[PDB]
Each structure stands twice: as structure tokens, then as C-alpha cells.
RNA sequence: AAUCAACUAGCCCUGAAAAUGGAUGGCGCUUAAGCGAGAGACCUAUACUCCGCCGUUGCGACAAGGUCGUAACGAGUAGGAAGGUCGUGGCGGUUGCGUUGAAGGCUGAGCGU
RNA sequence: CAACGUGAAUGCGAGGUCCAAGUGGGCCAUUUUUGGUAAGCAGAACUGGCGCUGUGGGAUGAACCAAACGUGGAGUUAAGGU
RNA sequence: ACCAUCUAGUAGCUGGUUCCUUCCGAAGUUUCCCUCAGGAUAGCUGGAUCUCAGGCAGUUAUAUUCGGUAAAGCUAAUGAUU
RNA sequence: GUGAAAUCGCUGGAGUGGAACCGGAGACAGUUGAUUACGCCGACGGCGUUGGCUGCUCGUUCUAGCCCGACAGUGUUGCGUCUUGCUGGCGGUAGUGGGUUCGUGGCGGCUAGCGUACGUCGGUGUGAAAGUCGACGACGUUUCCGACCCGUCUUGAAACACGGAUUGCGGAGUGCUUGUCUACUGCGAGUCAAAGGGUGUUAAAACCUUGCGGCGAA
């Protein structure tokens, strides 16, 4: 006998992607190569985007792609996000971009294209930058879902601002009693 | 005086004592391991003391066992390499396990009958 | 026996089979294994001189798992085509003729095995 | 089972120590306090008002906050499985300055000096580490004036 | 049929079973219950403070 | 509990003192000699003892030197007398005891033996106060001294012999008797 | 030529009576095979050391939903996960067998923990 | 902003979020301890156990002593014994 | 009363709850409840993982502190008492 | 049609002292395999690893005794501050010289399990068949060790706690509405489109179709 703990033996982890998406997979094949060969923890990280699941991938928006290239010197810069690139309506100017990605929505990559960017794949980012040189690694804001409105302390304990479960909304919703100091108290 | 209180602590589950020099260099030359990244590996060659501890000067067995004996400026660094040896039962048997050494027993500082004991150990 | 194109020897860590409990007193329990779940059972509880439980420990070792006595791996063969997935291999391999083929093609599948000299399990079976 | 009222079981806890009642000391309130100063709860049964809770008594903590004659002081509490850091306003007269960190400080401030000064003078870096006092040296004793005496164990006596 | 039974025998067990979780480093740096009057005295002063 | 393991329990001297203080610059050397199996019990008990007679005990203390005395001439044979305190189920006792041998650690040893057999007293309840070499003429003990006469002659009357390396059963007879 | 008295504590004895026939476990054991102090040797675990195999975990190599290497590890009720070329019945497809004998049924040679 | 550079021992990778099961009759032991004449009784404190657990020993035993478990082999032992 | 239907009436209660291996692995405790054979709640547990690559520890050392139990005292206050 | 299990009768073999069944390990009966080199088995050597038992020989630590000198004593022979013995410390140690302690010592002897730096060799197998050899030996028999009846509630079950005489077949976390989290897929400030309409004859499918509607964007 050995006095040892093992309820910490194992780690949950993605040695693959869930997905069945056959180039997702060969995707997955190609940077475990490239991460196993050139040892570069930038291509460590892009396998690991890759094998995630979706819910880590949240959208990237090309407002934050045009802030990321118009910085000082990263004008150059390739930008390599595993998010997908959607269009922001708000954004009035955009300049030339360089981005890899798995996906660019129909709107945002017409407006690249436009204003002279270009708009590669995760093979081709491998083929021009093997070692991830010249690079801004990107992604979208993870904690901004409705879900995650709901995490944190329950709603009804002292300073929580946490989002409940409710129906509907309205003053017949859970407005009246715990909420306001005319009724009982208020949290 | 910081390590005394431990073995006070620890008193009735171990026997413990002042090493000798045959002592250590027969537990370094016969049940010698180290801890590389983790892994148990014999050190059946000097290289293999040499990759972890060359940055202090050691680089044998021999280096090893005068850093150990003498308590030199990386004792810690020197007994954190090796493995926590893994001995045998004696040859012989014990005594009674259940009492302090001073007891006729074996748990407790049995001072330099250590060598002793781990003359069968070993 | 030796794993054929090697020199391995097949070691068998247990010959009996895993009866179920209590099988041998009722015949409404058949011997095949399952897991005592009772709270008090003492098959599950492993006392002394009660008959062991599978486990993983008793797993055969990896070279010599799956091998016949004669030293090859069974290989299903259902007709003459499926006799050439046998060809490369037929120094490990061994064919065997599927239950449901009849004396007809049973004729004309050991002729070609002996032809492309591929070793049979039960070539001489079904012989009318 | 046990009343839960604030005082519970604080007799000896809250009351003065013997010949020791009477007029609080000056030096109490001229004492300095500062927010990030380490501060001993020890509760003064003579005043009533911003007691500490009994189960702060004894404990010590580091000041937020420092109002006209109060401090606030976060306090680790055990609860279950959690050290919670509570925080209770508790006023000078309840309060202690605390040493263990003004060592510590004293301790810093000499370990710069020695620093600075033998590197100005161009000595070796000294050695600035609190060691665990290590096992005797090698002696040699005299008997000169000091001849050994023989003890023996001595009979049992009758002490009626 | 006696069914007050309170105890605290496994209790420690269980707390230590994830570890005593000591508080976190940041604590000390939030200014929460402070005087209102020293934080509006620290608010106009670093609304005021030149960059450069 | 302190037990007189071995054979032929060993003699020591130990020489100590209480670790020099300021007020103490200069501190008394104390020496006894203590029978125990080993070195490491004869400190032991040492510092049992010193710490029994003396306010000092083995934190504050110092072990000068730890010897061993072997008997100067095991070629000759002496009676001892061994003055022992000694706690009773009941009650506690002084007793002196005398033995015959050639060395003084296995008097001592026949005294531990002797306590054993006939007081049911265990080790750890025994002091032994003080050993010494009595004259013939200085003994007390009968036991001891119908073994002073130089006319001394006895028999072995009923000797039962053990056979060693045979089997079992046997046709020769048995003879106790030897003249 | 030792004697007398009062105590003391080891073993033994008295104090010590229950109902089916019965319990140092039994037989038995008396310079013990009992009581106390000890010594050599010896016996014996799923414990310790080493050796093989299975699998888990961590790490790693290899152009691969895979193979391999390596170190440590392997208790389990309630309960939770994973793997299952474990098994059963359909559907869309695919691969084949069958009156020279399918399903079903009885039962030897093997395979798999 | 300028300078200074890790300031006791030993061991060791650390932290975060979400979803959810079963449980919410306990019992035993060294020590402390309340009610009771006591109880294999009732009620508490620390720790370790059984419950959930097999294994060697105590002739037998949920808790005692030793020691915790893949499947095998050689050697050596623990408690206990010859 | 009997017959059919509402009706597969409800049950905090009793009984049963059907394949194999691998890994992890508890609780009988807190608070509220016409609550005490039951629930909700926190605790204990599993899984998914994610962010990183030195600050932690059921252990000591140093420094500083808290306590009024054992012991001690009543030829010291209170209460007994020769 | 097929024709299972429980249960039952016959023939042959074998066991059979107040249960019977069962796990581990052999043996027997039985079953089955068998192409100089090679397969299936054994023996003796070598080597690797882990050992077990047992001797000598050097030294090391702490220490003597024998031997010599004076003194003190006496369990004392032979014939009295006698002598011979003997003892005690004390002082010497030249020579001689054993105990005790172990060594990062030196040299041996016997022998075990596992594996194969590998050798020396025997059994058997190359048409059947018989024999021989090898492996199993499974619900047959016999031995040695172990071995209480399962499921369930329970702190605790082999229980003098409940259900269970035997066998076959059937037999119990489901459907749907509504939430939430998680995994995957498409698009993405959008997304899905409803009823409906148009078309479609392998026409309940598939395909096309939305100023408006749901959710989201305050």
C-alpha cells in the first residue's frame, strides 16, 4: 500500500475534435503535426482552438479585427482567429486586413476583399507562416452569452447581479417580494 | 531545528539514524533512482547524475554521495533527485515495531545501529 | 505452441470459465458471467475460497491474444473470393468456411485454398 | 441546546484582568493607525460600544478603513471548508498594534542596509537568510575544577 | 422514536476532504465600505491628476 | 517499556553535563555507570537517571563521552552484591541481593534474571542502585556462601540426557545414573 | 549452632453455589507443552524487494479514430462517467450465404478478462 | 518615473466556470465527558475505523493486532506463532 | 348490498426494477418547513473541461500574540467548614 | 411442421459412514494435435537478473589477560610478622596476546526461481493405422487446502427477519409539452420561417415561394 490520492489522476482533455467534420479533422491532423514537429506553442495553441468545442469559439467581430490591424506595426500582420468573422454594421471605414480563419460570414469578408484585405484558410496560414511568424492571435468575447448572464450567485443573496429564470418579464414576474423594501425586504 | 520536530512527530512509524559512509554509497550504487520529469530511472551511469545536477558541480555517483554525507551547499537539491529508496525487508526480520529502539523495539532514532539495519535492508 | 513467424510462447493466465454464482444450484440461472450486485454477497465481497471475479488483470497478453493452438488467427471466408484476403498473410491466417455454405461451393472453396495453399480449420467437413 | 445571544459565555473573555479596572489609558487613542497596519483584537469589557464579536477576541487582522475613532479590519474566519475574510469595525480602544509584522519590517529594512552598504564598500553580497539553528560543533571540555561526579540512583525512603 | 441525534463527528473530514480554502490576494485592494467622504476626496484627486 | 534485552547485559560509563547558559558560564560533569543492551539505551537511561537526580534534562543537556567497560580479568570468579529499589504491584522496596560470577555485568544480569523468576518484576521497575565486590567472609546470603569451601563435592544425581541427531525410537536403555 | 519476633510480595491454597454433557479451541502437558526474565534459529499475508503479463494515468516518438515506448499506479456500497468487431428487433444503404439444406433445437474443437 | 532583485525548512504544478447524482436512521474504539445504581443504556468533544472492506493473526466475531487488494512467480517479513 | 364507469383514483409507505469490462467514488452533518419514515438548502461526489506555468500546504522553524482547563491557592477576595 | 427446459423410465460405467453442490492444485479415465533443418517436450552446462545458506583472511574502534614490581587481604597446601597458593585494586608492557566493533575491505564453497551473450544432447513428428510423444482434462472419479443461501430493508443477515418447490415464455425510467445546460451542424446582426400558395404521379415525399410572424438586435 501507497499512501496517494487519485482523484486527480486523470485529466479531462480533447486529444481530437468531437466534431466529425472530416477537414476539421485533417485540420486537427495537420497542426498536431505541426505543433509535435516544430515545437512552437502558437501552433500548440491553434490545435487546441481547433479541437474545442464551439461554445469556446465565440464570434469575432471585423470591428475588433480593424482595431487589431490599425495598432502601431501590426499593419503587416497577419490576424489568425479560429472564430468565425461576422460583419459590424456599425463600422464605417474598414482598412486591409490579412486573415485566417475557419469561417468569414458573406458581409464581412466582401468588405475585406473590398478594401484590398485578404482572406486565407488554416492550411495556407500553415504554408505562409509555419512557425506562426507575423501573427495576431484573435478570438471572440467567451463571457458575453445569455447563458453566462445567468452564472454567478443565485439571484436572491446580497449583492448578486445574476439573471434569473423567468417566464416572461413584466411587473407580475418576479418583481415583488425579495426585490423591493415595500415588500418584506430587498437583496 | 527544523527538521528534529518532524521526527519527533513521525517517531512510531519510523526508524531512523546517522548513515555511515559505506551506508550511503551502498544505497546510492544498489538502489539508486532518480526523478526525471517525473520518472523513476536507475542511475546505472554518472550522465544520468550529471544531466540534473551538473548545474551544482556534481557529476557522479561519487560527487552524490559527498554531497550527502558532508551536507554540502545542495543537499537539498542533491536528495530531491533521488527517488525515496525502495528497500527490502531485512534478512532476519525485526524486533518488535510496536516499541522505540530504547524499548527493544524499532521505531524511534536507533542513532548508528541504522548501518546495522540496513547492512540486511539493503 | 509459438505465434506463428515469431517465437512467443502462448500463455494461458486462466483455463476455467468465470461460472456464474449459484448456476450450479439453479438451473434457471445460466452459466454465463454476471456481476454479483447484492449487498451481502459474498462472491462480491471476495471472501477466501469463493470463486474469483473478471478483471482486466486476467487480460491475455497482446502478441498471443486472439491465436489458435496451431499458432495462426482465424480469418471467415464465405465464398472463393473472400480466400484472397488470406493471400498475403496465409503465414498467420488460417481460413475458415462459414457455417452457411453449402457442400456445392464448400467443393470448389478447399480446391482453390489448396491451390493458392492457404491453410483450412474445416476443410474436410460437409462432404456429401 | 445553547442561547445565541452576543455575549454568550465572554465572563472571564470581556471582563479586565485582577487590580487592572478603572480609567483607560491615554496611549490607547494616541496610538497611530493606518489602512494596511496589522492590528491584535483583544475586547475591553469597559466599553461597550464597537465591541468585536467573541470569536474575533484573540485575532488578528489588517485595517481598510480609519474613521473619526474606529477602524475597519478584515479578519480570517473559519466556516466549514472556507477561510472567509470578514470585515468588522471595531473601535481603538478593542485594538492592539500588532509586532510580528513590524519585525518583519525591522528585519527588511536591516537586510537592505547590509545589502546596500557591503555592495557600496565593494564586499560580497552577505548572506540575508534566517537559517534553522543548526547541530552543536565540535568542543572540547575541562575537568580542571570540574571533576566529574558519580550520581547512583538513591534507595527508597519512608515519607510519612 | 428519538430523532434530534446531532453531532459533528465526519464534519472536519469533509472540510479538509477539498482542502481549506484560504482567502484570495485581491481583497485588500478593493476600497468597498471605505468613508464616503476620503472616497470622494481620492475620486477629485485622481480626476485631476495631468498624465504628463 | 524499558526491557533487559540480550544476553549478558553491557556495561557503561556515561559522562555528561547541562549545556553552559549565561547566568551558568560553567556547568558540574556528571558520570554513572548504566547496564543496558546497547549505547543508545545507555544514554537513555542516563538522562533518565540525571533528570531524576538533577534539574536538567536531555533537551538542555550534552552527552560528553559514552564508553564501554569491559571486565579486567573474566579469568577469576568473585561474589557481588547488588543493592536494587524496586516497585511491588503494591508497594516500593530496597533489596540486596548477592550472585557469584566473573564478571560484574553478569552479576547484573543474573540479578535481572533472578528479580524475573521470583518477584515477577519487569526491567523498567527496577533500579539497581549500586554493585560491588563483597569478601567471602563479608557475604550474607546462604546460597552464596555454601559455595566458600575448598572441600566442596557433590554428585550429578539424576541426569536425563537429551539425544541430538537420532530418531525417535530407540532399543538401548535409558541410565539416569553415573558412578 | 544459629535462634526469636513483627512485617513485606512472588507462586500455590481457602474465601469461590445452578440448573441438557462440555470446554486454556481440543488432545494432552508437571526440571512442562505452566508462570517470569532471556538467546539462537525457524514458520507464515492479497504487506515489502525483484521478475513477467493485463489495463489506467502522465509524458513522449512516429505520415494516425492508429501503433509503439516509457515511469508510476490498480480496494469499493449508494452514485457518476467511458469503452464494448457484447447481445436483440426494425428502417435507408451496402456485403454475402441458402432444398448439394436457412432459421430453430441438442451437443465436441477452440477464441475472448 | 529611477535604483535595488526573490530574504526560513521540507514537499509539490496551480487556478476558474458550468451541469448533475446519491446522502440528509448511523454504529464501534483509545482518551475527555453529562444523565443514570448500572446497562451490549441515553447524550456530547478530537481522531481513527465498520458502514462501502477483502487479506495474515486473536479456536469463532462489522469494529481488536498486523496490513488494505489487477493477474502470476521468487525472496523477505508484520502481527501471531514453533 | 350488488354491477359498470369516473379509475391505470392518491400513497412522504412495502416489494421489484433485466448485459460485460474500465476509471473516479460518498452520506447519515448545517439551516428552514404542522417537520421528526418526507422535502428544500449547504456540505461530501462525478463529468465536461478552460486559463495558465510558483504560490500553496490537516508538516515544521522564527517572531508576535489569544485563552483560564489540568496543576496550584484559600496562613489572597466570595461561599462553605474542624 | 419444428419439438426446448423442468420432470420421468431404461441400458452401461462410477461413487455411496448424519446433506449435496462449489473455488484453487494434482492424479486417473477420457479427448485431441504431431514438418540435416524445423515443430512439441525434457536433461546437463554457460550467460543476465533477483537471490538463499556457509566459510576463511586483512585491517579499524574500545579494551585487556599472560608477564614484572610494591602494598592489602585470605574459601589456602606443606611444616603462624612461616611458607606455598589465591584474590584485590595500583603502577608498568618489553615480549606474548585474546575479547568487542564494524569496514566506500580481499579471497572462497554449495545452491534456488525467472529469462535466454548461447551451447552439448536425448525422446518423439513427415502416407496410413498402431504405438510413442505433446497439450488439455471441461458439470466423470479420487485426493490436500478453502468453502454458511441468494435478493432485500438495515448500524448490523447464514440468521430463530421477509420473498423464493421446479422449468419455459411475458415482465418494469416511457411518450409528449415546457425549461435549462452540455455536445455537434448551418448561417450569422441576423436566423427560422407558420398557416398558405405554386409545383410534384416511384404525389402524404422532394423542390420553389414571406412589406408582415417568433426569438435576437435596448
Request: charged fraction near 30%; glycine fraction near 6%; include cysteine.
Given at each position: 500500500?501507497?499512501?496517494?490520492?487519485?482523484?486527480?489522476?486523470?485529466?479531462?482533455?480533447?486529444?481530437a475534435?468531437?466534431?466529425?467534420?472530416?477537414?476539421?479533422?485533417?485540420?486537427?491532423?495537420?497542426?498536431?503535426?505541426?505543433?509535435?514537429?516544430?515545437?512552437?506553442?502558437?501552433?500548440?495553441?491553434?490545435?487546441?482552438?481547433?479541437?474545442m468545442?464551439?461554445?469556446?469559439?465565440?464570434?469575432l467581430?471585423?470591428?475588433?479585427?480593424?482595431?487589431?490591424?490599425?495598432?502601431?506595426?501590426?499593419?503587416?500582420?497577419?490576424?489568425?482567429?479560429?472564430?468565425?468573422?461576422?460583419?459590424?454594421?456599425?463600422?464605417?471605414?474598414?482598412?486591409?486586413?490579412?486573415?485566417?480563419?475557419?469561417?468569414?460570414?458573406?458581409?464581412?469578408?466582401?468588405?475585406?476583399?473590398?478594401?484590398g484585405?485578404?482572406?486565407?484558410?488554416?492550411?495556407?496560414?500553415?504554408?505562409?507562416?509555419?512557425?506562426?511568424?507575423?501573427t495576431?492571435?484573435?478570438?471572440?468575447?467567451?463571457?458575453?452569452?445569455?447563458?453566462?448572464?445567468?452564472?454567478?450567485?443565485?439571484?436572491?443573496?446580497?449583492?448578486?447581479?445574476?439573471?434569473?429564470?423567468?417566464?416572461?418579464?413584466?411587473?407580475?414576474?418576479?418583481?415583488?417580494?425579495?426585490?423591493?423594501?415595500?415588500?418584506?425586504?430587498?437583496? | 531545528?527544523?527538521?528534529?520536530?518532524?521526527?519527533?512527530?513521525?517517531?512510531?512509524?519510523?526508524?531512523?539514524?546517522?548513515?555511515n559512509?559505506?551506508?550511503?554509497?551502498?544505497?546510492?550504487?544498489?538502489?539508486?533512482?532518480?526523478?526525471?520529469?517525473?520518472?523513476?530511472?536507475?542511475?546505472?551511469?554518472?550522465?544520468?547524475?550529471?544531466?540534473?545536477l551538473?548545474?551544482?558541480?556534481?557529476?557522479?555517483?561519487?560527487?552524490?554521495?559527498?554531497?550527502?554525507?558532508?551536507?554540502?551547499?545542495?543537499?537539498?537539491?542533491?536528495?530531491?533527485?533521488?527517488?525515496?529508496?525502495?528497500?527490502?525487508?531485512?534478512?532476519?526480520?525485526?524486533?518488535?515495531?510496536?516499541?522505540?529502539?530504547?524499548?527493544?523495539?524499532?521505531?524511534?532514532?536507533?542513532?548508528?545501529?541504522?548501518?546495522?539495519?540496513?547492512?540486511?535492508?539493503? | 505452441?509459438?505465434?506463428?513467424?515469431?517465437?512467443?510462447?502462448?500463455?494461458?493466465?486462466?483455463?476455467?470459465?468465470?461460472?456464474?454464482?449459484?448456476?450450479?444450484?439453479?438451473?434457471?440461472?445460466?452459466?454465463?458471467?454476471?456481476?454479483?450486485?447484492?449487498?451481502?454477497?459474498?462472491?462480491?465481497?471476495?471472501f477466501?475460497?469463493?470463486?474469483?471475479?473478471?478483471?482486466?488483470?486476467?487480460?491475455?497478453?497482446?502478441?498471443?491474444?486472439?491465436?489458435?493452438?496451431?499458432?495462426?488467427?482465424?480469418?471467415?471466408?464465405?465464398?472463393?473470393?473472400?480466400?484472397?484476403?488470406?493471400?498475403?498473410?496465409?503465414?498467420?491466417?488460417?481460413?475458415?468456411?462459414?457455417?452457411?455454405?453449402?457442400?456445392?461451393?464448400?467443393?470448389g472453396?478447399?480446391?482453390?485454398?489448396?491451390?493458392?495453399?492457404?491453410?483450412?480449420?474445416?476443410?474436410?467437413?460437409?462432404l456429401? | 441546546?445553547?442561547?445565541?445571544?452576543?455575549?454568550?459565555?465572554?465572563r472571564?473573555?470581556?471582563?479586565?484582568?485582577?487590580?487592572?479596572?478603572?480609567?483607560?489609558?491615554?496611549?490607547?487613542?494616541?496610538?497611530?493607525?493606518?489602512?494596511?497596519?496589522?492590528?491584535?483584537?483583544?475586547?475591553?469589557?469597559?466599553?461597550?460600544?464597537?465591541?468585536?464579536?467573541?470569536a474575533?477576541?484573540?485575532?488578528?487582522?489588517?485595517?481598510?478603513?480609519?474613521?473619526?475613532?474606529?477602524?475597519?479590519?478584515?479578519?480570517?474566519?473559519?466556516?466549514?471548508?472556507?477561510?472567509?475574510?470578514?470585515?468588522?469595525?471595531?473601535?481603538?480602544?478593542?485594538?492592539?498594534?500588532?509586532?510580528?509584522?513590524?519585525?518583519?519590517?525591522?528585519?527588511?529594512?536591516?537586510?537592505?542596509?547590509?545589502?546596500?552598504?557591503?555592495?557600496?564598500?565593494?564586499?560580497?553580497?552577505?548572506?540575508?537568510?534566517?537559517?534553522?539553528?543548526?547541530?552543536?560543533?565540535?568542543?572540547?571540555?575541562?575537568?580542571?575544577?570540574?571533576?566529574?561526579?558519580?550520581?547512583?540512583?538513591?534507595?527508597?525512603e519512608?515519607?510519612? | 422514536?428519538?430523532?434530534?441525534?446531532?453531532?459533528?463527528?465526519?464534519?472536519?473530514?469533509?472540510?479538509?476532504?477539498?482542502?481549506?480554502?484560504?482567502?484570495?490576494?485581491?481583497?485588500?485592494?478593493?476600497?468597498?465600505?471605505?468613508?464616503?467622504?476620503?472616497?470622494?476626496?481620492?475620486?477629485?484627486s485622481?480626476?485631476?491628476?495631468?498624465?504628463? | 517499556?524499558?526491557?533487559?534485552?540480550?544476553e549478558?547485559?553491557?556495561?557503561?560509563?556515561?559522562?555528561?553535563?547541562?549545556?553552559?547558559?549565561?547566568?551558568?558560564?560553567?556547568?558540574?560533569?556528571?558520570?554513572?555507570?548504566?547496564?543496558?543492551?546497547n549505547?543508545?539505551?545507555?544514554?537513555?537511561?542516563?538522562?533518565?537517571?540525571?533528570?531524576?537526580?538533577?534539574?536538567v534534562?536531555?533537551?538542555?543537556?550534552?552527552?560528553?563521552?559514552?564508553?564501554?567497560?569491559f571486565?579486567?580479568?573474566?579469568?577469576?570468579?568473585?561474589?557481588?552484591?547488588?543493592?536494587?529499589?524496586?516497585?511491588?504491584?503494591?508497594?516500593?522496596?530496597?533489596?540486596?541481593?548477592?550472585?557469584?560470577?566473573?564478571?560484574?555485568?553478569?552479576?547484573?544480569?543474573?540479578?535481572?534474571?533472578?528479580?524475573?523468576?521470583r518477584?515477577?518484576?519487569?526491567?523498567?521497575?527496577?533500579?539497581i542502585?549500586?554493585?560491588?565486590?563483597?569478601?567471602?567472609?563479608?557475604?550474607?546470603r546462604?546460597?552464596?556462601?555454601?559455595?566458600?569451601?575448598?572441600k566442596?563435592?557433590?554428585?550429578?544425581?539424576?541426569?536425563?540426557?537429551?539425544?541430538?541427531?537420532?530418531?525417535?525410537?530407540?532399543?538401548?536403555?535409558?541410565?539416569?545414573?553415573?558412578?
Amino acid at each position: 500500500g501507497i499512501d496517494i490520492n487519485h482523484k486527480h489522476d486523470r485529466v479531462a482533455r480533447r486529444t481530437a475534435p468531437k466534431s466529425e467534420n472530416p477537414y476539421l479533422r485533417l485540420l486537427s491532423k495537420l497542426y498536431a503535426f505541426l505543433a509535435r514537429r516544430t515545437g512552437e506553442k502558437f501552433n500548440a495553441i491553434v490545435l487546441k482552438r481547433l479541437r474545442m468545442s464551439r461554445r469556446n469559439r465565440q464570434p469575432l467581430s471585423l470591428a475588433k479585427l480593424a482595431r487589431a490591424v490599425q495598432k502601431a506595426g501590426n499593419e503587416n500582420k497577419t490576424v489568425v482567429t479560429l472564430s468565425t468573422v461576422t460583419d459590424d454594421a456599425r463600422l464605417y471605414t474598414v482598412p486591409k486586413i490579412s486573415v485566417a480563419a475557419l469561417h468569414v460570414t458573406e458581409g464581412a469578408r466582401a468588405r475585406i476583399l473590398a478594401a484590398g484585405g485578404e482572406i486565407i484558410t488554416l492550411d495556407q496560414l500553415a504554408l505562409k507562416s509555419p512557425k506562426g511568424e507575423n501573427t495576431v492571435f484573435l478570438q471572440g468575447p467567451r463571457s458575453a452569452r445569455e447563458a453566462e448572464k445567468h452564472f454567478g450567485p443565485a439571484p436572491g443573496v446580497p449583492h448578486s447581479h445574476t439573471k434569473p429564470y423567468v417566464r416572461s418579464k413584466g411587473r407580475k414576474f418576479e418583481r415583488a417580494r425579495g426585490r423591493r423594501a415595500s415588500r418584506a425586504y430587498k437583496n | 531545528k527544523a527538521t528534529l520536530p518532524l521526527l519527533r512527530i513521525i517517531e512510531p512509524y519510523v526508524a531512523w539514524g546517522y548513515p555511515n559512509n559505506k551506508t550511503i554509497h551502498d544505497l546510492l550504487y544498489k538502489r539508486g533512482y532518480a526523478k526525471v520529469d517525473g520518472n523513476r530511472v536507475p542511475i546505472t551511469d554518472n550522465t544520468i547524475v550529471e544531466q540534473s545536477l551538473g548545474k551544482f558541480n556534481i557529476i557522479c555517483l561519487e560527487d552524490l554521495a559527498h554531497e550527502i554525507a558532508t551536507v554540502g551547499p545542495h543537499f537539498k537539491e542533491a536528495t530531491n533527485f533521488l527517488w525515496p529508496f525502495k528497500l527490502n525487508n531485512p534478512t532476519g526480520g525485526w524486533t518488535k515495531k510496536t516499541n522505540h529502539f530504547v524499548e527493544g523495539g524499532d521505531f524511534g532514532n536507533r542513532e548508528d545501529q541504522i548501518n546495522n539495519l540496513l547492512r540486511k535492508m539493503v | 505452441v509459438h505465434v506463428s513467424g515469431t517465437k512467443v510462447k502462448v500463455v494461458k493466465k486462466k483455463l476455467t470459465k468465470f461460472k456464474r454464482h449459484e448456476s450450479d444450484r439453479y438451473r434457471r440461472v445460466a452459466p454465463s458471467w454476471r456481476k454479483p450486485k447484492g449487498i451481502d454477497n459474498r462472491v462480491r465481497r471476495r471472501f477466501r475460497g469463493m470463486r474469483a471475479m473478471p478483471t482486466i488483470g486476467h487480460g491475455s497478453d497482446r502478441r498471443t491474444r486472439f491465436v489458435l493452438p496451431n499458432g495462426y488467427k482465424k480469418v471467415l471466408v464465405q465464398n472463393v473470393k473472400d480466400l484472397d484476403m488470406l493471400l498475403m498473410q496465409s503465414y498467420k491466417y488460417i481460413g475458415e468456411i462459414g457455417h452457411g455454405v453449402s457442400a456445392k461451393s464448400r467443393k470448389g472453396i478447399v480446391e482453390r485454398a489448396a491451390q493458392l495453399n492457404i491453410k483450412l480449420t474445416n476443410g474436410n467437413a460437409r462432404l456429401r | 441546546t445553547n442561547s445565541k445571544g452576543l455575549r454568550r459565555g465572554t465572563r472571564y473573555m470581556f471582563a479586565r484582568d485582577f487590580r487592572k479596572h478603572g480609567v483607560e489609558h491615554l496611549s490607547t487613542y494616541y496610538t497611530q493607525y493606518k489602512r494596511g497596519d496589522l492590528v491584535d483584537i483583544k475586547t475591553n469589557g469597559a466599553f461597550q460600544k464597537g465591541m468585536p464579536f467573541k470569536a474575533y477576541h484573540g485575532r488578528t487582522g489588517r485595517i481598510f478603513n480609519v474613521t473619526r475613532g474606529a477602524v475597519g479590519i478584515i479578519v480570517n474566519k473559519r466556516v466549514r471548508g472556507n477561510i472567509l475574510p470578514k470585515r468588522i469595525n471595531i473601535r481603538i480602544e478593542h485594538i492592539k498594534p500588532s509586532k510580528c509584522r513590524t519585525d518583519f519590517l525591522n528585519r527588511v529594512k536591516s537586510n537592505d542596509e547590509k545589502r546596500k552598504a557591503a555592495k557600496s564598500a565593494g564586499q560580497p553580497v552577505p548572506a540575508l537568510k534566517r537559517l534553522p539553528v543548526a547541530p552543536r560543533g565540535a568542543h572540547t571540555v575541562t575537568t580542571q575544577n570540574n571533576e566529574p561526579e558519580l550520581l547512583a540512583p538513591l534507595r527508597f525512603e519512608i515519607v510519612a | 422514536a428519538k430523532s434530534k441525534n446531532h453531532t459533528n463527528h465526519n464534519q472536519n473530514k469533509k472540510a479538509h476532504r477539498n482542502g481549506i480554502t484560504k482567502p484570495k490576494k485581491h481583497i485588500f485592494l478593493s476600497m468597498k465600505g471605505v468613508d464616503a467622504k476620503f472616497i470622494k476626496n481620492l475620486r477629485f484627486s485622481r480626476k485631476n491628476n495631468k498624465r504628463q | 517499556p524499558t526491557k533487559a534485552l540480550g544476553e549478558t547485559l553491557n556495561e557503561y560509563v556515561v559522562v555528561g553535563r547541562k549545556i553552559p547558559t549565561e547566568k551558568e558560564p560553567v556547568t558540574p560533569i556528571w558520570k554513572m555507570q548504566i547496564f543496558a543492551t546497547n549505547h543508545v539505551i545507555a544514554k537513555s537511561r542516563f538522562w533518565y537517571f540525571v533528570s531524576m537526580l538533577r534539574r536538567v534534562k536531555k533537551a538542555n543537556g550534552e552527552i560528553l563521552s559514552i564508553k564501554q567497560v569491559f571486565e579486567k580479568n573474566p579469568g577469576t570468579v568473585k561474589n557481588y552484591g547488588v543493592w536494587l529499589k524496586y516497585d511491588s504491584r503494591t508497594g516500593h522496596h530496597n533489596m540486596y541481593r548477592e550472585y557469584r560470577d566473573t564478571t560484574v555485568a553478569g552479576a547484573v544480569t543474573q540479578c535481572y534474571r533472578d528479580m524475573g523468576a521470583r518477584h515477577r518484576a519487569q526491567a523498567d521497575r527496577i533500579h539497581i542502585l549500586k554493585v560491588q565486590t563483597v569478601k567471602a567472609e563479608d557475604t550474607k546470603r546462604a546460597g552464596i556462601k555454601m559455595f566458600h569451601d575448598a572441600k566442596i563435592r557433590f554428585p550429578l544425581p539424576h541426569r536425563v540426557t537429551k539425544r541430538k541427531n537420532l530418531s525417535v525410537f530407540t532399543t538401548a536403555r535409558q541410565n539416569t545414573h553415573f558412578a
